[PDB]
Design a protein around this ligand. Structure first.
Ligand SMILES: [Ca+2]
Ligand SMILES: [Ca+2]
Lengths: 675, 675
């Protein structure tokens, strides 16, 4: 049949791509080709409009199997060709060794690191439910799409997938349909060596529906029927167990050796012969397969055309909601939304930046409907929903509704990070956030790094940023955390000092389209600074206190800016004139013009950094660094600051030493370099 | 009864400690006091010998409940007093807000970050099984101890606990007994908001045994019986469901408000009144409770005395095993074990450092019985057991034995990290390791940080360290990873360049007693260097190529040392004389004398760093830094190096620019500072 020919075509494209690279993973593509064929036949998508908001989404969580994804995209006429397949895993190609959403048309997310894609799928499905609840009306099914995820044994061992699966079951996400490649093989060999749990029993315990397909090597009718069954279960995510043979058809089928290395040339020849292909030919695409796939694309394009007309009729009946939806699909925030950002003066009271952040959210959430977010491993007293909103929950629970805006992630930081990526990936201008303690953003490093690589505008609301949290002690107090994330490409790491800086941090986070944000916020109260503003803080770094005859400039962030200002007064008494620079986001500052940056950190003056965390990175901006490069302590916060000499007198002493160290030396800006 | 009085005493000590601090968590201590009393009565331990190797171990994984742990330790006469309790959460006290194994007698591990303690318990139990299989003989039960773990709802949501629980069930760890505080409350409020899974069904799916105690607020008889039942099930870890009231006895019992904030003073008064205590008195310890607890301590001390005699008789019957066990309990490695480390010369072939590491392990494992380890999310071709050993598995599986030395962790990096901490915590000189790709050590950051804080000599064997891995691409290629871990206090991060440096890295890792190690190893082949040795590399940084008239020194690590040596030859052709420094471990180097360090990085010469990763940290050792501060690429590794100009010519160009930049400038060592 043409279906059988299509499956062979998929298999052989994947095998041939791996062969050309002499690198990559042919086993899972061979095993999953029947399922991929069956699922893509059920999916609604337009290869010529990858951003259609009512498309079904597909996520290949076992991302090493991506020769499979690329083969599907090529066969369906996405902006990816057989010539691109021939360049699989080759420098600069459109077919990298793991799929990248920035580089690959039809790759919704960046997968490869195990466990991530299934969580991303949870987030896409969460967003779809929230979006549909927000926009759908009687006779106007604006959003009714499904989220299809392929996953492997490795994904099921990673804790992040357990977290997301528990939460997805709780959230009754009936438009999520996941497929487990039950092939009994991982990298180390048999799953009998380390993975003997009853996976199906576990998924039932989370509240998922199960369908089992006992012969997924051939039974595409049963795979299609499993999809139909899953669609009837509207209040549970579904796991479809696909019992497959890894490397199906290969001489080495059913072995670990086919998981992650190219097949032997003679093996590829017999594959081709047994499936009716020419063993002397590579990258064959039978025209009958193309025709069959083009028929499904044509049908999907007519569905999209009808959706466009539905949307036009929606705008006529619901003008305000229609305009809102149009604006979001255009990628634009509401006009002048930022007028809602709170502004402070030095006459206002001291406030913790965690509380300032709460206040910002309270003001902007009602004005910007595409903001949703939540928290994990965090008291409601440290972050909760904006007044006038409700939690995102299935209505059946009585605890919220899918129209809700605040997600109760539970104690699941890593999955929260990966789910945020999926919400961003959904599109429709979603600007989503996740709260936890800064120190436990580290639990989610796998996902955070992927936010950066994937260019997703997600936001971490990361409170209790330092020893300033006090009594919980060194297990909770960040030291290395900002250095870690600042060292990662494409992460804005805001550490605002006061009310105006906190508003600038949110302006950046919400306006972002390609850069994830981490907002490092305090437990303890900080003063409103003389010289701060949203305008100046928006530059990432700025001159807070200008001193034309400066003996030294102190550059600081967050809680240490006020400390620097107090140190300036001590230094004046010692006959030393200091300027102060506030550097709320190093990435934003780095992106400013060279002349702007040099106006902030000029030549001819020693510069001392102060931040109660690792000194790593700080030499970009300073000659000497006062930081904390040891673990913290359990006690009242002001006593810990005194212990480590983060006091006005301690800063002044180090500033005076810095001035002395550079007497008679020529000093140029830390921004200067040799290359 | 005295048992009831003891439980009230525990409860009130915990409440009073939280009250004195005006900080901390009284709810779980109130709920878990009956269970803590019952479990400690069943445990064998000596408060006067916290390191008795056959003690039962207790782990409080819900570490925020530590007022409870401290109360138990005080009541049993550990080196912790009521005066220490009065200083709970106070700077410099022996009673920090979360328990720290370095600071607190009877704290086996450092808990607080959720999910970790249960995994640590898995590791303690794994080590006990391996230890018993190694040493026990007929009539000589050298090791027969249990591992008791308390955990909460938050712990059960964290993915790391799922990973460890799946693995513990697979490993049939029948001496592990965990207790779930089933109190329906987390920080956000009811578990109904985010945690509605069937926990018991999930634990059955992992192969655990279950006991349910429906009234754990009062039924200590049933808690004791649950322990007895668990001990009869020798081939499954057991989860005991303790249905408790959070804050039991408080006016606010059964609410989120009692989870993490001090009780009201009037509430504490009525607690005391209803339990027969004086509401005007704090930190009361009834003498009858002390007597009862002292009786159990006396009995346990007689058990230890009998164990000491058993050990003496074991040494008579089994002299060689006895001497080995004695050596390990003394914390000493075999005499001259390091003579087994491989040594190379520049005449030897190029080898990848991953392969050099395999070879080291192959040579040292047979000589050092306290080395065990494994791998997670890694092909057996990248790391497997040492020849002549077997996997650690229950014999019932036919796949290994508990005497085995190689652990199949599955795709569970985070749990592997936390389990390694538990193996180290067991003691007996265990020197344990875990293999994965360097980029996915980040999945385990929560545990890695705790290795550092806890001072555990664990080792990560972290291969595929850079863009040198090639085709898997930017999702797999570390950029930020070494900066992250180098910025963390107390982590040795070895990046060996060649065979001799790899042997030095292992010498450091295995000799370690207080510092975790990460070994960053290459996929690609590297040459044996002229000038390397185990002796010199043991200093962390050393002069590889000395040049008395140097125009520049190039400092490099790992794969970039050979690159620097090739660049020296290009520079000679341009009339520039360079020295080379190899810096295989920054921490070890930092610990050397100031004079040694200055001999390596002298004044009066520009210094350029080269490492194909983040430049963060490198200004400690250099004036200019050539690194990679963007994500990688998917292609053949040598082509990626060429793209980013990590070539002899690219290094030489930057070196020449550095020389030019410092012409006419006075240059001092990067090791100099103002303070
Ligand atoms: Ca598999
Ligand atoms: Ca609880």
């Amino acid at each position: 049949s043409v279906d059988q020919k299509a499956i062979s075509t998929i298999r052989l494209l994947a095998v041939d791509a791996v062969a050309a690279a002499n690198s990559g993973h042919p086993g899972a593509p061979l095993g999953l080709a029947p399922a991929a064929h069956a699922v893509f036949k059920k999916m609604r998508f337009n290869p010529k409009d990858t951003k259609w908001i009512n498309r079904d989404r597909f996520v290949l969580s076992n991302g090493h199997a991506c020769a499979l994804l690329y083969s599907m995209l090529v066969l369906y006429g996405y902006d990816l060709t057989v010539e691109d397949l021939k360049k699989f895993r080759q420098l600069g190609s459109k077919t990298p060794g793991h799929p990248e959403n920035t580089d690959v048309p039809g790759a919704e997310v960046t997968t490869g690191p195990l466990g991530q894609g299934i969580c991303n799928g949870v987030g896409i499905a969460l967003a779809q439910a929230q979006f549909a609840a927000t926009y759908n009306k009687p006779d106007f099914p604006i959003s009714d799409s499904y989220t299809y995820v392929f996953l492997g044994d490795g994904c099921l061992m990673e804790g992040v997938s357990s977290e997301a699966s528990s939460l997805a079951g709780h959230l009754q996400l009936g438009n999520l349909i996941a497929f487990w490649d039950d092939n009994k093989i991982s990298i180390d060999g048999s799953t009998e060596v380390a993975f003997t749990e009853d996976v199906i029993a576990r998924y039932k315990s989370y509240g998922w529906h199960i369908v089992e397909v006992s012969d997924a090597d051939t039974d595409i009718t049963a795979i299609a029927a499993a999809i139909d069954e899953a669609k009837k279960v509207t209040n549970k995510p579904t796991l479809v167990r696909l019992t497959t043979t890894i490397g199906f058809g290969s001489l080495a089928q059913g072995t670990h050796g086919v998981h992650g290395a190219p097949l032997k040339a003679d093996d590829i020849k017999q594959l081709k012969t047994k499936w009716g292909f020419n063993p002397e030919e590579s990258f064959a695409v039978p025209a009958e397969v193309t025709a069959s796939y083009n028929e499904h694309v044509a049908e999907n394009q007519k569905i999209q055309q009808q959706w466009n007309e539905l949307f036009a009729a929606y705008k006529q009946k619901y003008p305000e909601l229609g305009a809102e939806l149009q604006r979001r699909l255009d990628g634009k925030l509401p006009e002048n939304w930022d007028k809602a950002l709170p502004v402070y003066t030095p006459a206002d009271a001291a406030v913790a930046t965690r509380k300032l952040s709460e206040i910002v959210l309270s003001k902007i959430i009602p004005e910007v409907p595409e903001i949703i977010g939540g928290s994990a491993d965090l008291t409601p007293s440290n972050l909760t929903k904006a007044k006038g909103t409700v939690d995102f929950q299935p209505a059946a629970t009585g605890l919220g509704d899918y129209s809700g805006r605040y997600i109760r992630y539970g104690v699941r930081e890593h999955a929260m990070g990966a789910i945020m990526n999926g919400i961003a990936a959904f599109g429709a201008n979603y600007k989503n956030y996740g709260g936890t303690f800064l120190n436990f953003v580290s639990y989610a490093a796998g996902a955070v790094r992927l936010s950066a690589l994937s260019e997703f505008p997600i936001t971490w609301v990361a409170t209790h940023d330092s020893i300033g949290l006090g009594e919980d002690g060194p297990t909770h107090q960040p030291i290395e955390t900002l250095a870690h994330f600042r060292a990662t490409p494409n992460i804005s790491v805001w550490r605002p000092a006061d009310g105006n800086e906190t508003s600038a941090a949110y302006k950046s986070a919400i306006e972002s389209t390609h850069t994830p944000h981490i907002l490092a916020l305090t437990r303890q109260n900080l003063p409103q600074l003389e010289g701060s503003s949203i305008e100046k803080a928006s530059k990432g770094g700025y001159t807070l206190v200008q001193q034309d005859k400066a003996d030294i400039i102190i550059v600081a962030t967050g809680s240490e800016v006020s400390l620097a200002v107090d140190a300036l007064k001590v230094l004046e008494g010692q006959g030393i004139k200091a300027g102060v620079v506030s550097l709320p986001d190093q990435l934003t500052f780095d992106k400013q013009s060279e002349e702007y940056k040099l106006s902030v950190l000029p030549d001819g003056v020693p510069i001392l950094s102060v931040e109660v965390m690792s000194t790593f990175g700080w030499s970009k901006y300073s000659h000497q660094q006062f930081g904390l490069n040891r673990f913290g302590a359990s006690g009242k916060a002001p006593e810990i600051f005194k212990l480590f000499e983060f006091t006005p007198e301690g800063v002044a002493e180090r500033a005076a030493k810095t001035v002395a160290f550079y007497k008679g030396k020529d000093v140029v800006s830390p921004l200067r370099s040799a290359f």
